[PDB]
UniProtKB/Swiss-Prot annotation, chain A:
Name of the gene encoding the protein in the UniProt record: MED20
GO function term, MF aspect, one: transcription coactivator activity
Its job: Component of the Mediator complex, a coactivator involved in the regulated transcription of nearly all RNA polymerase II-dependent genes. Mediator functions as a bridge to convey information from gene-specific regulatory proteins to the basal RNA polymerase II transcription machinery. Mediator is recruited to promoters by direct interactions with regulatory proteins and serves as a scaffold for the assembly of a functional preinitiation complex with RNA polymerase II and the general transcription factors.
Family to which the UniProt record says this protein belongs: Belongs to the Mediator complex subunit 20 family.
Assembly, per entry: Interacts with PPARG. Component of the Mediator complex, which is composed of MED1, MED4, MED6, MED7, MED8, MED9, MED10, MED11, MED12, MED13, MED13L, MED14, MED15, MED16, MED17, MED18, MED19, MED20, MED21, MED22, MED23, MED24, MED25, MED26, MED27, MED29, MED30, MED31, CCNC, CDK8 and CDC2L6/CDK11. The MED12, MED13, CCNC and CDK8 subunits form a distinct module termed the CDK8 module. Mediator containing the CDK8 module is less active than Mediator lacking this module in supporting transcriptional activation.
Name under which the protein is recorded: Mediator of RNA polymerase II transcription subunit 20
Keyword Transcription regulation included in the entry's annotation: yes
Swiss-Prot/TrEMBL keywords: Activator, Nucleus, Transcription, Transcription regulation
Coiled-coil intervals: none
Spans traversing the lipid bilayer: none
Lineage: superkingdom: Eukaryota
Cystine residue pairs: none
Curated annotation (Swiss-Prot), chain B:
Protein name: Mediator of RNA polymerase II transcription subunit 17
Family: Belongs to the Mediator complex subunit 17 family.
Tissue spec. comment: Ubiquitous.
Function summary: Component of the Mediator complex, a coactivator involved in the regulated transcription of nearly all RNA polymerase II-dependent genes. Mediator functions as a bridge to convey information from gene-specific regulatory proteins to the basal RNA polymerase II transcription machinery. Mediator is recruited to promoters by direct interactions with regulatory proteins and serves as a scaffold for the assembly of a functional preinitiation complex with RNA polymerase II and the general transcription factors.
From Swiss-Prot, chain C:
Effect ascribed to mutating G243S: In NEDSCAC; uncertain significance
Top-rank taxon, per record: Eukaryota
Modified residues (Phosphoserine): S101
Protein name, entry field: Mediator of RNA polymerase II transcription subunit 27
Disease named in the record: Neurodevelopmental disorder with spasticity, cataracts, and cerebellar hypoplasia: An autosomal recessive disorder characterized by global developmental delay, impaired intellectual development, and poor or absent speech. More severely affected individuals do not achieve independent ambulation, whereas others develop some speech and can walk, or show regression later in childhood. Additional features include axial hypotonia, peripheral spasticity, dystonia, cataracts, and seizures. Brain imaging usually shows cerebellar hypoplasia, thin corpus callosum, cerebral atrophy, and hypomyelination.
Function: Component of the Mediator complex, a coactivator involved in the regulated transcription of nearly all RNA polymerase II-dependent genes. Mediator functions as a bridge to convey information from gene-specific regulatory proteins to the basal RNA polymerase II transcription machinery. Mediator is recruited to promoters by direct interactions with regulatory proteins and serves as a scaffold for the assembly of a functional preinitiation complex with RNA polymerase II and the general transcription factors.
Gene: MED27
Residues with N6-methyllysine modification: K103
Organism for this UniProt entry: Homo sapiens
Subcellular location: Nucleus
From Swiss-Prot, chain D:
Tissue specificity remark: Expressed in brain, heart, kidney, liver, lung, pancreas, placenta and skeletal muscle.
Organism: Homo sapiens (Human)
Keyword terms of this UniProt record: Acetylation, Activator, Coiled coil, Nucleus, Transcription, Transcription regulation
Function, as annotated: Component of the Mediator complex, a coactivator involved in the regulated transcription of nearly all RNA polymerase II-dependent genes. Mediator functions as a bridge to convey information from gene-specific regulatory proteins to the basal RNA polymerase II transcription machinery. Mediator is recruited to promoters by direct interactions with regulatory proteins and serves as a scaffold for the assembly of a functional preinitiation complex with RNA polymerase II and the general transcription factors.
Signal sequence extent: none
Protein name listed in UniProt: Mediator of RNA polymerase II transcription subunit 30
Lineage: Eukaryota, Metazoa, Chordata, Craniata, Vertebrata
Protein family per UniProt: Belongs to the Mediator complex subunit 30 family.
Keyword Kinase included in the entry's annotation: no
Residues of the full protein shown: 29 to 178 of 178
Length: 193, 86, 263, 126
């Protein structure tokens, strides 16, 4: 678990959704960053309250089920199979699935991932996550993430996230990154326009 | 010219590979599971990384390890002799 | 309290300053103007000196007003005073004389394990943030696992009451907790640079005879790595390249520094 | 003889300052049984320090009264600028110590090999 921050960066001007990622990723490459593979984050939804199940590719076997403010269960992939078996019993929702797919760039112990939350078949928006694997402590590693973001992100740099929340010596968790992703996804689904 | 150390290491590595099957770790650490690699089970439950705490999760050969050991021994000997001459 | 003692000592000097400054204003006026080689120069010099003297009286008076807000038997007191005096004098003398030593040569191990255990326990008593776990998996050579907050997990390898090898690891990383993972790497470049700097500190902190102050100073220097990822380069900004703040903390000066910047 | 008495005088003046430093450290560590030990240690240090004064004084008198016949050349006239049986004994001792050092190097090589082998085996046994 390494402190992470995810924010949405608007494409701006008349730059196409893809055109902006191409440019932002080249700007990241212009930090001496080297590509270290590909990352896929695919999330499905249920209208039950509301259930969310998300799975970052960075984690090979885990599937995360988050119940809004309620607890997140980090479970094996067989969890998706249990979900499908229950499916007739379970609620399904209507094409609310949201995915962000983009390149992973490593720059000296910081992994930066810029991706386009493509809703369904049509892209709309952009998610940036900067993670620090060495920084086990969180909520005060904010100075680091902020300085690195001002280096590359510049404008639209986020003024923290609430997943850090109350000041505590509590260690950062894979659950916290998933909660950041869920808030970001709720915003793309509803930003509209 | 026989280096008994490398023979002992070969024997211990083969015995470790043999014990891998009878390994106490891979034997359903919890209860009513699947009996396999409890460390990997805990890593999958605690959401481990792609390569970090996974990648190959022990996938080498006796020859590779033995060659690495021999190379290290030679390097050590070389450095020692060099400093002695110095 | 000590803060009250200092405020009183500062105030005593301020009363002395006010009296001296008032005497100076009148004493200089009595001497009057001096020739100064020029009409403009003489007038300017007298006005400048008088104004400086007048201002000093105002400054000294103001300090006294501000300092108001902040704040068989005699032989015993004599002994107390002589004890304090000898303490200060011998401290200064030992410092000044061991700073410059004229020793040039020596010519003109076995240690109890319980003694090493006692030394390690004494060192663990201080620095409440650090927690040192003693263990002897292989022989009398002790291996110490030192946890520093959620930041560091250092693996010190004692051969005796002597530091031989150190490999720091991350808190989330696994030291394998059992038969101890002496030989491994942290898989993160920052912690590898920290291992290099720890070996450098070991090579630096090397006292010849006494084997305890070396471990004391090593633990004190390690404790400085608790403000890691949170402190500036005192020459560079927070992330000089992308290594964090201070892979380096100066010996004799627990200040953060990037290895690429300097020191 | 005299060239060794001079080295003795050098080591005495190099050690007297260390003795004074140890005395300063002892007076510093004396904060208010153990008091008796500190007192007798300080007294022994003072006695050995006075003995060192006497020794350095006597070696000074010796080197000053010696003044062998071969000293007409003042200093700075001796530095070289650009522009018998004792040697045989030295060579014999050198050959002996060379042989002994070769043997000791062989012994150290064998010991290092033994230690490396034992360490490798006890590491791989796990």
């Amino acid at each position: 678990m390494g402190v992470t921050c995810v924010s949405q960066m608007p494409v701006a001007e008349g730059k196409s959704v893809q055109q902006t990622v191409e440019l932002l990723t080249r700007k990241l490459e212009m930090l001496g960053a080297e590509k270290q593979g590909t990352f896929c984050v695919d999330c499905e939804t249920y209208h039950t309250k509301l259930m969310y199940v998300m799975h970052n590719s960075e984690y090979p076997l885990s599937c995360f089920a988050l119940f809004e403010n309620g607890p997140c269960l980090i479970a094996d992939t067989n969890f998706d199979v249990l979900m499908v078996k229950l499916k007739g019993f379970f609620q399904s929702a209507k094409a609310s699935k949201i995915e962000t797919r983009g390149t992973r760039y490593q720059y000296c112990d910081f992994l930066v991932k810029v991706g386009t939350v493509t809703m369904g078949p049509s892209a709309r928006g952009i998610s940036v996550e900067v993670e620090y694997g060495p920084c086990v402590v969180a909520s005060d590693c904010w100075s680091l993430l902020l300085e690195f973001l001002q280096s590359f992100l510049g404008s639209h740099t986020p003024g923290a996230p609430a997943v850090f929340g109350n000041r505590h010596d509590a260690v950062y968790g894979p659950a916290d990154t998933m909660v950041q992703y869920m808030e970001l996804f709720n915003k793309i689904r509803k930003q509209q326009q | 010219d026989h280096l008994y150390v490398l023979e002992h290491n070969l024997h211990l590595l083969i015995r470790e590979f043999h014990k891998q099957t009878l390994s106490s770790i891979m034997m359903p650490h919890p209860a009513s599971a699947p009996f396999g690699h409890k460390r990997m089970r805990l890593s999958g439950p605690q959401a481990f990384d792609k390569n970090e705490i996974n990648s190959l999760q022990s996938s080498e050969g006796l020859l590779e390890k033995i060659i690495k050991q021999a190379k290290h021994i030679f390097l050590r000997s070389r450095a020692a002799a060099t400093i002695d001459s110095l | 309290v000590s803060v009250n003692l200092e405020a009183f000592s500062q105030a005593i000097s301020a009363i002395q300053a006010l009296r001296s400054s008032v005497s100076r204003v009148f004493d200089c006026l009595k001497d009057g103007m001096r020739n100064k080689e020029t009409l403009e120069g003489r007038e300017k010099a007298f006005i400048a000196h008088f104004q400086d003297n007048l201002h000093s009286v105002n400054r000294d008076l103001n300090e006294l007003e501000r300092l108001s807000n902040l704040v068989l038997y005699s032989q015993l007191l004599q002994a107390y005073k002589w004890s304090n005096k000898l303490q200060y004098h011998a401290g200064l003398a030992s410092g000044l004389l061991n700073q410059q030593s004229l020793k040039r040569s020596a010519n003109q191990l076995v240690l109890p394990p319980q003694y090493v255990d006692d030394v390690i326990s004494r060192i663990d008593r201080m620095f409440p943030e650090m927690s040192i776990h003693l263990s002897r998996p292989n022989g009398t050579s002790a291996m110490l696992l030192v946890t520093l907050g959620k930041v560091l997990k250092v693996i010190v390898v004692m051969r005796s009451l002597f530091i031989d090898r150190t490999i720091v690891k991350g808190y989330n990383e696994n030291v394998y907790t059992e038969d101890l993972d002496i030989w491994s790497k942290s898989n993160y470049q920052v912690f590898q640079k920290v291992t290099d700097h720890a070996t450098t500190a070991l090579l630096h902190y090397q006292l010849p005879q006494m084997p305890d102050v070396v471990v004391r100073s090593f633990m004190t220097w390690l404790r400085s790595y608790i403000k890691l990822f949170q402190a500036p380069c005192q020459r560079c900004g927070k992330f000089l390249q992308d290594g964090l703040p201070p892979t380096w903390r100066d010996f004799r000066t627990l200040e953060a520094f990037h290895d690429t910047c300097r020191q | 003889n005299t060239a060794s008495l001079c080295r003795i005088g050098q080591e005495t003046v190099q050690d007297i300052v260390y003795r004074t430093m140890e005395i300063f450290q002892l007076l510093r560590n004396m904060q208010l049984g153990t008091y008796q030990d500190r007192l007798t240690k300080l007294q022994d240090n003072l006695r050995q320090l006075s003995v060192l004064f006497r020794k350095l004084r006597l070696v000074y008198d010796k080197c000053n009264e010696n003044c062998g016949g071969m000293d007409p050349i003042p200093v700075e006239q001796l530095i070289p600028y650009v522009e018998s049986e004792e040697r045989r004994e030295i060579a014999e001792v050198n050959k002996k110590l060379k042989q002994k050092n070769q043997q000791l190097k062989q012994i150290m090589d064998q010991l290092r090999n033994l230690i490396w082998d034992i360490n490798a085996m006890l590491a791989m046994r796990n």
